[PDB]
Scaffold this active site. Structure first.
Site, PDB file in Angstrom:
ATOM      1  N   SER A 214       0.799  -1.233   0.000  1.00 59.38           N
ATOM      2  CA  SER A 214       0.000   0.000   0.000  1.00 59.38           C
ATOM      3  C   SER A 214       0.827   1.275   0.000  1.00 59.38           C
ATOM      4  O   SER A 214       1.678   1.480  -0.844  1.00 59.38           O
ATOM      5  CB  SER A 214      -0.955   0.049   1.215  1.00 59.38           C
ATOM      6  OG  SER A 214      -2.348   0.127   0.938  1.00 59.38           O
ATOM      7  N   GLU A 347      -8.178  -7.022  -5.232  1.00 59.36           N
ATOM      8  CA  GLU A 347      -7.806  -5.858  -4.426  1.00 59.36           C
ATOM      9  C   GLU A 347      -8.993  -5.095  -3.831  1.00 59.36           C
ATOM     10  O   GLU A 347      -9.044  -4.867  -2.624  1.00 59.36           O
ATOM     11  CB  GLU A 347      -6.969  -4.883  -5.261  1.00 59.36           C
ATOM     12  CG  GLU A 347      -5.576  -5.379  -5.652  1.00 59.36           C
ATOM     13  CD  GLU A 347      -4.532  -5.123  -4.579  1.00 59.36           C
ATOM     14  OE1 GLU A 347      -3.373  -5.567  -4.774  1.00 59.36           O
ATOM     15  OE2 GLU A 347      -4.872  -4.503  -3.530  1.00 59.36           O
ATOM     16  N   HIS A 467      -6.901  -6.542  -1.001  1.00 59.52           N
ATOM     17  CA  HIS A 467      -5.830  -5.666  -0.521  1.00 59.52           C
ATOM     18  C   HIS A 467      -5.471  -6.013   0.939  1.00 59.52           C
ATOM     19  O   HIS A 467      -6.375  -6.165   1.766  1.00 59.52           O
ATOM     20  CB  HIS A 467      -6.289  -4.196  -0.611  1.00 59.52           C
ATOM     21  CG  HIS A 467      -5.188  -3.190  -0.523  1.00 59.52           C
ATOM     22  ND1 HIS A 467      -4.149  -3.133  -1.434  1.00 59.52           N
ATOM     23  CD2 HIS A 467      -4.980  -2.176   0.351  1.00 59.52           C
ATOM     24  CE1 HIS A 467      -3.347  -2.136  -1.108  1.00 59.52           C
ATOM     25  NE2 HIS A 467      -3.828  -1.535  -0.033  1.00 59.52           N
TER      26      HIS A 467
HETATM   27  B1  LIG Z   1      -2.991   1.038   1.866  1.00 59.35           B
HETATM   28  O1  LIG Z   1      -3.271   0.283   3.337  1.00 59.35           O
HETATM   29  O2  LIG Z   1      -1.834   2.205   2.200  1.00 59.35           O
HETATM   30  C1  LIG Z   1      -4.375   1.840   1.373  1.00 59.35           C
HETATM   31  C2  LIG Z   1      -5.194   2.333   2.404  1.00 59.35           C
HETATM   32  C3  LIG Z   1      -6.364   3.004   2.070  1.00 59.35           C
HETATM   33  C4  LIG Z   1      -6.728   3.186   0.696  1.00 59.35           C
HETATM   34  C5  LIG Z   1      -7.926   3.875   0.397  1.00 59.35           C
HETATM   35  C6  LIG Z   1      -8.303   4.079  -0.910  1.00 59.35           C
HETATM   36  C7  LIG Z   1      -7.489   3.587  -1.926  1.00 59.35           C
HETATM   37  C8  LIG Z   1      -6.311   2.909  -1.636  1.00 59.35           C
HETATM   38  C9  LIG Z   1      -5.920   2.715  -0.300  1.00 59.35           C
HETATM   39  C10 LIG Z   1      -4.701   2.008   0.015  1.00 59.35           C
END
Ligand SMILES: *[B]([O])([O])C1=[C][C]=C2[C]=[C][C]=[C]C2=[C]1
Length: 566
Positions: A214, A347, A467
């Site tokens: 992320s 995801e 995700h």
């Molecule tokens: B990741 O855990 O850094 C991440 C967190 C929250 C999101 C919100 C919307 C799109 C993508 C994300 C990735």
């Protein structure tokens, strides 16, 4: 947030405290650092392994008082031995379970782990950067325990860095020295520390891999893009993210005033007075209020976070992002180190809990105009060009006459992850020495072993690979258990830590000593490729064409009459 999930979290936090004590040993040890001596201790794992543990190593001056919103400063050396047998606090943030603000402004620390302080050979060094949207996360072993990776002969380092407004406030006024990206600058200083001290823990400073998931993947990418870090490391792994994802940067210079006003600032909008007020506010107040900063217009246009990585309005000695990341891709030293990228097989499944609280969001798929890349869309998103472009997205993800929740989450997979990966790959191909990039696709589903993000996304009883689902097979967490040696979960741990360790070592993720890779031929992507190939990681390990490729091309077609912006 439900209080069943809170008491169970509270008890599991009580269990973690007790279990952490139990797995501690009396075997303390001292290592050298360029800032002086630190004391670690050896710990046990539920698989009856052991590792030396050093936590609370400062790589920066605590960024409090006049250092708030500023670039980090080198820490002060000490005589004697710093205690490092305990973790420090996490960056100030909203606890995603309890919903209350937790953590501390004193949070710029890293942790070092290894199964052997005195290896006979210099070891590969893996540096993990946690995700959390640049607003949550920690290097605490209750979320990122090294218990799996230390089965391997590596040195693993987990860093923290400033989150949210405290990490990513940005002001146009050159006088004030708040250009932005403090938290990324935290990352740069921690890397510089790692380059100069990993040898002390048995690590090869000429073989360092940075990786993250992320916002950690976007971070890892930023560390590969900026000239500040040139040569500091030798391989990179982007797990479900990179710097050109739409959520990974924002121009947030106007939003500091809005934060101040939410916090009760009285006066006009000028950077000096806004800053003076923000400097005096309790850190917990700015963080709790951060949730209200984005306007309804920004939210509609898919701006996820009010403060994050930004194009810095002017240049300073510590500047990390002098221009938009797409531009930075043109001249990036990181284009020429071995790279591995990947995503999970579903995801957008991660957005369930948000969809649940905002059902109307699904209606956005009726035209899909709100998911057209912002640079292509008009402000009102009513232009016929925007409706046309939205139709291309709709054709790619809406399966029936009416859009469903699953169509929404599938579209999300591409908007937030697959399409930016595609753009980065094609962009990078036009500016690289020819070092290989490998693609994986994480496709292993299990409910027998989980991590806390499933509790956040409410993916309990939910099929598919969301995700963050892969974190479980990389790191220990306080919801984890000892698994049977022959379980599909245990074997995936071995494969994932094995592939990651393999790539870290050699810059090539293939090893026939990894179980399931017997018939794998894992080739990196070439500029001439029209179809991406990836290692699909499931119960079986299998090279396949990227399933998402058809939809990726469909997103790309939005750029048919604006190729210069692709
Ligand atoms: B990741 O855990 O850094 C991440 C967190 C929250 C999101 C919100 C919307 C799109 C993508 C994300 C990735």
């Amino acid at each position: 947030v439900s209080l069943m999930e809170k008491l169970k979290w509270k008890i599991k936090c009580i269990e973690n405290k007790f279990l952490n004590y139990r797995l501690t040993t009396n075997e303390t040890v001292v290592a050298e650092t360029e800032y002086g001596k630190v004391k670690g201790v050896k710990r046990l794992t539920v698989y009856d392994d052991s590792y030396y543990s050093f936590e609370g190593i400062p790589y920066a001056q605590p960024p409090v008082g006049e250092l708030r919103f500023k670039a980090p400063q080198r820490p002060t050396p000490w005589a004697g031995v710093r205690d490092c047998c305990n973790h420090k606090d996490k960056s100030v943030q909203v606890d995603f379970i309890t919903g209350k603000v937790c953590g501390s402004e004193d949070c710029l620390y890293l942790s070092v782990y290894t199964n052997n302080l005195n290896p006979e050979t210099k070891r590969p060094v893996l540096v993990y950067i946690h995700g959390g949207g640049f607003i949550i996360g920690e290097n605490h072993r209750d979320m990122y325990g090294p218990d799996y990776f230390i089965k391997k002969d590596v040195v693993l380092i987990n860093i923290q860095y400033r989150l949210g407004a405290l990490g990513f406030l940005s002001l146009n006024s050159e006088d004030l020295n708040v250009p932005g990206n403090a938290g990324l600058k935290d990352q740069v200083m921690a890397l510089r520390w790692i380059k100069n001290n990993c040898a002390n823990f048995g690590g090869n400073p000429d073989n360092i891999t940075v990786f993250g998931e992320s916002a950690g993947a976007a971070s890892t990418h930023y560390m590969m893009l900026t000239e500040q870090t040139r040569g500091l490391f030798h391989r990179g792994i982007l797990m479900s993210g990179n710097a050109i994802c739409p959520w990974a940067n924002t121009q947030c210079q106007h939003r500091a005033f809005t934060l101040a006003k939410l916090a009760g600032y009285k006066g006009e909008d000028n950077d000096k007075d806004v800053l003076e007020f923000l400097m005096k506010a309790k850190p917990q107040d700015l963080i709790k209020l951060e949730e209200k900063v984005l306007t309804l217009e920004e939210r509609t246009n898919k701006v996820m976070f009010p403060f994050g990585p930004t194009v810095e309005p002017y240049q300073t000695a510590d500047c990390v992002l002098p221009k938009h990341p797409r531009e930075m891709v043109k001249t990036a030293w990181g284009n020429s180190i071995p790279t591995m990228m990947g995503n999970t097989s579903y995801e957008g499944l991660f957005f369930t809990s948000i969809l649940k609280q905002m059902p109307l969001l699904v209606k956005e798929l009726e035209t899909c105009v709100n998911f057209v890349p912002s640079e292509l869309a008009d402000a009102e998103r009513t232009a016929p060009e925007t409706l046309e472009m939205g139709a291309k997205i709709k054709k790619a993800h809406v399966t029936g006459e009416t859009p469903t929740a699953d169509n929404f989450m599938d579209l999300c997979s591409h908007f937030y992850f697959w399409f930016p990966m595609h753009r980065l790959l094609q962009l990078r191909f036009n500016h690289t020495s020819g070092t290989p990039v490998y693609l994986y696709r994480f496709d292993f589903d299990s409910e027998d072993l989980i991590n806390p993000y499933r509790i956040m996304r409410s993916g309990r009883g939910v099929k598919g690979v969301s995700h963050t689902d892969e974190l479980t097979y990389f790191f220990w967490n306080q919801l984890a258990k000892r698994m049977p040696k022959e379980s599909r979960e245990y074997k995936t741990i071995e494969r994932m830590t094995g592939i990651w360790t393999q790539f870290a070592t050699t810059g090539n993720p293939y090893s026939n000593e990894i179980e399931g890779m017997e018939n794998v031929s894992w080739d990196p992507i070439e500029k001439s490729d029209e179809v991406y190939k990836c290692l699909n990681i499931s119960d079986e390990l299998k090279m396949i064409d990227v399933p998402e490729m058809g939809k990726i091309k469909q997103w790309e077609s939005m750029f048919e009459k604006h190729r210069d912006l692709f």
